[PDB]
Amino acid sequence: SGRDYEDELQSERDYVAGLYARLDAERAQSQRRYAAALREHGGTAVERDAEVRALAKDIARLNVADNGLCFGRLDTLDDARLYIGRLGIFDRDNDFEPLLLDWRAPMARPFYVATAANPENMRRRRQFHTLGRKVVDFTDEILGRPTGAEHDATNDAALLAAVNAPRGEGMRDIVATIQAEQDQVIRLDHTGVLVIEGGPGTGKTVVALHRVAYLLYTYRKQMERHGVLVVGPTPAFLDHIGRVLPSLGESDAVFMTPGDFVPGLHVTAEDTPEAAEVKGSLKILDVLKAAVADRQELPSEPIPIDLSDVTMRIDAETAKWARDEARKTGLPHNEARAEFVDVVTYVVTERAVARIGRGWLTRDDKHAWEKMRADVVGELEDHEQFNAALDALWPILTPEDVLAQLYTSHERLRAAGAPECLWRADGEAWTVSDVPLLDELVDLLGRNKAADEAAERERREEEAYAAGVLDLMDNRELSERAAADREWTYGHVVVDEAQELSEMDWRLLMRRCPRRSFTIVGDLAQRRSPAGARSWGAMLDSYVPGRWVYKSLSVNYRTPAEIMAVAAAVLAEFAPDATPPDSVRACGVAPWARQVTDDDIASAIAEFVSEEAGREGTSVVIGPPDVPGTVPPSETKGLEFDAVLVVEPERILADGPRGAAELYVALTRATQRLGVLYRDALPQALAGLA
Secondary structure, three states: OOHHHHHHHHHHHHHHHHHHHHHHHHHHHHHHHHHHHHHHOOOOHHHHHHHHHHHHHHHHHHHHOOOOOEEEEEEEOOOOEEEEEOOOEEEHHHOOEEEEEEOOOHHHOHHHHOOOOOOOOEEEEEEEEEEOOEEEEEEEEEOOOOOOOOOOOOOHHHHHHOOOOOOOOOOOOOHHHHHHHHHHHHOOOOOOEEEEEOOOOOOHHHHHHHHHHHHHHHOHHHHOOOOEEEEOOOHHHHHHHHHHOOOOOOOOEEEEOHHHOOOOOOOOOOOOHHHHHHHHOOOHHHHHHHHHHHOOOOOOOOEEOOOOOOOOEEOHHHHHHHHHHHHHHOOOHHHHHHHHHHHHHHHHHHHHHHHHOOOOOOOOOHHHHHHHHHHHHHHHHOOHHHHHHHHHHOOOOOHHHHHHHHHHOHHHHHHHOOOHHHOOOOOOOOOOOHHHHHHHHHHHHOOOHHHHHHHHHHHHHHHHHHHOOHHHOOOOOHHHHHHHOOOOOOOEEEEEOHHHOOHHHHHHHHHOOOOOOEEEEEOHHHOOOOOOOOOHHHHHOOOOOOOEEEEEOOEEOOOOHHHHHHHHHHHHHHOOOOOOOEEOOOOOOOOEEEOOOOOHHHHHHHHHHHHHHHOOOOEEEEOOOOOOOOEOHHHHOOOOEEEEEEEOHHHHOOOOOOHHHHHHHHHHOEEEEEEEEOOOOOOOOOOOOO
């Protein structure tokens, strides 16, 4: 925040205001011509209709571009300024100098594909963050070795400028290496599944978003109507993405946490690690199917049907055989219900007619036999007891019913083949591991056609009553339509912190992306989830074996080396095979530790809070929920802060079998300074932090 930035922003605001003035002038001219064409067009009806439609299309085109007219600016190496927006605007008075470029024009291509290691003759790319007509702010990206001058809202420019290292045995530009790796990630031709993995502080998220922007510009024909699915660990991370997400053209993005997959349901609770592991693996699919198959009951004792004349019954043999036929049909449960009903009806009807036709009737009397069968079927259809018995043997199911009955009772649990770990008192107390099972049960169960039809006709009847005429009887945004439907298929899927996704989450995401375009971002060592990935292949080979590309970003520049010494020391203990990233930037202040006493903890935390108010940037306190004014490390899993104050490393390191990774994430969050307080002693680590 500074007067220079404010003045540059004001200049850009004035330019955008002039653009909007031109927009309004053109819209006024178009509206006047539209009225004139409606009222006084002397041509034929077809010509009048054509001109009126052209003007209406023009007016609609102007209106849709009113919001967020301008995307940003390109500063060429030759100092030429190009403005990129939703529409092209030209001066007829000066031979059509473009005041604004339509983002799809070739001259606007660099705004999407340009990179800091293979620039398209451009010096700088500036992005405008806007609301309505006003520019809320702007952010600069320098396509070279930045000097840390211009404001970027990501600090990458200043941090890269703050690089510090000797030339080395072989002279290396260091910065150019980072630019080259990020470019080679971004400009990759492979449009299939891509995996980006790098140590913390390498800015993997922004690189991935740049890759997404490049893909969505290059292949806009194949993806723009399908949109993007951005999956994040926490809502705050998705707000961060919303802040830093580059231009997508006319496309749109749908933001979801793994607990948001089921439309209309939000879940935050976490299971025990054992239950999480069993629910996350694909071998739960064997349980779920079994849990469905168990709902197809059989009579305990024969069920009297009591036809008006022949006192029929349905028995174990008939029910068993009809259930086998329905299962063989291969349709979902709520669809195979119809086959089950049909088979039982046929068996009962044939027995009943054979009884009625005793002596005098035989199958060779084809017509009499068929009409007798039709009569008996008609009588059965309205037979309340028969229908109730069938509904008791093969009920219509919903996913919540299946999972609640499965979790709440040990009998159905054993029948499905699940272990005792899954039992819980409350069936419908959903947890993040249940969401993919609920989604899969929608495919396993399906819809019952007759029930939906009856509900529709009823709804029409009550709506006619409400309208008071009883006796006489979408234009949504891409994200709105996409998030409301589970069947929506996305053109691209972005997953950051992807190591936390279990096998079932990957199954769901692949179900929602048949095109198999994925940008997967994460770091395996940082995994906190019990069911997370141990290796990318184990997750991705079930879908794209040998057709997924791996890229890495070893160089680390955003987070100081001094705290990285401690982070690498911890990494050496909870993961002996792990190799930390190459740190190429030391801070001006080393991290610090102190043994804060029991009552001094609040004083120290408040002191840090007070100090960070006069500072510049953003900072946070990481600690157990038991300590006032602190957040757990998992709540910061994908974020970055200037200053972090960590509470009781020896305590948060012990919760769960994966606490060391949580502490590693917590320590590595900071970009400027790291303070830590402990109570007993250092946890046989952090010796380089004092």
